[PDB]
Design a protein around this ligand. Structure first.
Ligand code: CU
Ligand code: CU
Ligand code: CU
Ligand code: CU
Length: 503
């Protein structure tokens, strides 16, 4: 049992380009097995990290900066986490496959990290949709918090759990005039839950509880809940802050876990941004939900709290009620850093302008069948990944997607390429829907909360509700994906191709 708040929060260094001109910025990032200490009292942990770091280096770019990243695999030929060879069928494929997805990137399709565009060490073998070694990110999109992570077919949950996550921030110079906290007062917080063995090794389950002797071994599990919470690669850390305003880029980089965050003194956050950038107006919040892959861009004002220790707390359980001594804690702010200068930052109310013909309305069901071993296989609209593509929006057109969730839990649905607006949620009769396919509403539609009135790319589709979103598909055409971002679901098999067409 690990003592909370004994290690300082690491802040990943910002990556430096290999080459840079006015016309092009070129980066190199190599996936490496590495070892890092995750807590004062733990032996160092074997991890996989981008440039050997966990989290990977923060990448900072400007809006419209012409950026290239050569993501390279220099990993061992065998995994250290348990592979289930039964969940995917294919010559010999390598055991360790990787591909990097820039989550939220407005990105040409062959640079988006398609799950079948994977590569092994030194690109020796490549998947059937691989086109290029050096990914192109034109960054023609709103300032926002993005993040990058592995997306390889049938291995995403393992490769991400291993450590392959990092932040990517797009800065729009037109927002500088808002005077939001910046530089050292603008800090990413990548939250990852983990279970760690006494010898410092990562624990990831090789089977569910009570496995039959015919269940494959290893077997995928449908959800993972870590015993410990890390921020920026350290267990239950502390951060010393100045008594002033900070901006935090809060990223949920966990496999399954949803957080519900608050400050233990009852203090408020100010939300300034969602996945897709600044909200139209700042939103004062006492708490917020944060499902896998969601980002909240927030201001915490420590001005009136000098000397205090304030816990970033969590009320959401994972596989049970939250434990006050463990997963109810994220990190600890200590307002004990002297002011380096006057706080000239602002927490303005007016942040951005607010968020068209409906070409199509797609009705989509979240469901799942059972495999020959009795395991649940989670599916989008009862199709497998490999089935012919059905979500085929036309480029430059707007659609409404109506996501029906008759399952017992929330699924955070992510669409690549685009960000979208949230229209509403509406409860329905689950038994009736399961029995007949008939959708009968048991309540009026509810508009999104203020947090969800801007632009999103990953959205909680709660149980027994229809969620409606609207997106304009573009600016690129090509082969992308949409999926549940619970990685244990994604990999078996809650992920579908999404082809944006250009007739
Ligand atoms: Cu993602
Ligand atoms: Cu994505
Ligand atoms: Cu799911
Ligand atoms: Cu994805």
């Amino acid at each position: 049992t690990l003592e909370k708040f004994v290690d300082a929060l690491p802040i990943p260094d910002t990556l430096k380009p290999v080459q840079q001109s006015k016309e092009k910025t070129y980066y190199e990032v190599t996936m490496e097995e590495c070892t890092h200490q995750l807590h004062r009292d733990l032996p160092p942990t074997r991890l996989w990290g981008y440039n050997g770091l966990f989290p990977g280096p923060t990448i900072e770019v400007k809006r419209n900066e012409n950026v290239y990243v050569k993501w390279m695999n220099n990993l061992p030929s065998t995994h250290f986490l348990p592979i289930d060879h039964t969940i995917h069928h294919s010559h010999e494929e390598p055991e360790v496959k990787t591909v990097v997805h820039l989550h939220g990137g407005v990105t040409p399709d062959d640079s988006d990290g398609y799950p079948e565009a994977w590569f092994s060490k030194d690109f020796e073998q490549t998947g059937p949709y691989f086109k290029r070694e050096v990914y192109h990110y034109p960054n023609q999109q709103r300032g926002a918090i993005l993040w990058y992570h592995d997306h390889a077919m049938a291995l995403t949950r393992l490769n991400v759990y291993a450590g392959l996550v990092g932040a990517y921030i797009i800065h729009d110079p037109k927002e500088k005039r808002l005077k939001l906290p910046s530089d050292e007062y603008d800090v990413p917080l990548l939250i990852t839950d983990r279970t760690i063995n006494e010898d410092g090794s990562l624990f990831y389950p090789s089977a569910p509880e009570n496995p039959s002797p015919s269940l494959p071994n290893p077997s995928i599990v449908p959800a993972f809940c870590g015993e410990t919470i890390l921020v920026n690669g350290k267990v239950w850390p502390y951060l010393e802050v100045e008594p002033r305003k900070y901006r935090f880029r809060v990223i949920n980089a966990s496999n399954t876990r949803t957080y519900n965050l608050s400050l233990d003194n009852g203090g408020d956050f100010i939300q300034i941004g969602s996945d897709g950038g600044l909200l139209p107006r700042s939103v004062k919040l006492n708490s917020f939900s944060l499902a896998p892959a969601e980002r909240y861009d927030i201001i915490i004002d420590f001005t009136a709290y000098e000397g205090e220790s304030i816990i970033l707390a969590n009320s959401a359980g994972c596989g049970g009620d939250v434990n006050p001594e463990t997963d109810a804690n994220i990190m600890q702010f200590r307002v004990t850093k002297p002011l380096a200068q006057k706080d000239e930052s602002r927490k303005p109310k007016y942040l951005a302008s607010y968020p068209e013909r409906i070409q199509n309305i797609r009705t989509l069901k979240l469901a799942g069948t059972q495999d020959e071993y009795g395991r649940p296989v989670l599916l989008l609209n009862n199709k497998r990944w490999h089935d012919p593509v059905t979500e085929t929006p036309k480029v430059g057109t707007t659609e409404i997607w109506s996501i029906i969730n008759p399952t017992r839990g929330t699924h955070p649905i992510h669409l690549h390429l685009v960000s979208f607006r949230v229209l509403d949620r509406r409860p329905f009769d689950i038994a009736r829907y399961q029995e007949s396919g008939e959708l009968s509403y048991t309540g009026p539609a509810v508009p999104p909360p203020p947090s969800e009135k801007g632009w999103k790319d990953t959205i909680q589709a709660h149980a027994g509700e229809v969620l409606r979103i609207a997106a304009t598909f573009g600016p690129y055409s090509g082969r992308y994906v949409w999926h549940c971002h619970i990685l244990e679901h994604e990999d078996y098999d809650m992920m579908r191709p999404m082809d944006i067409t250009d007739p």
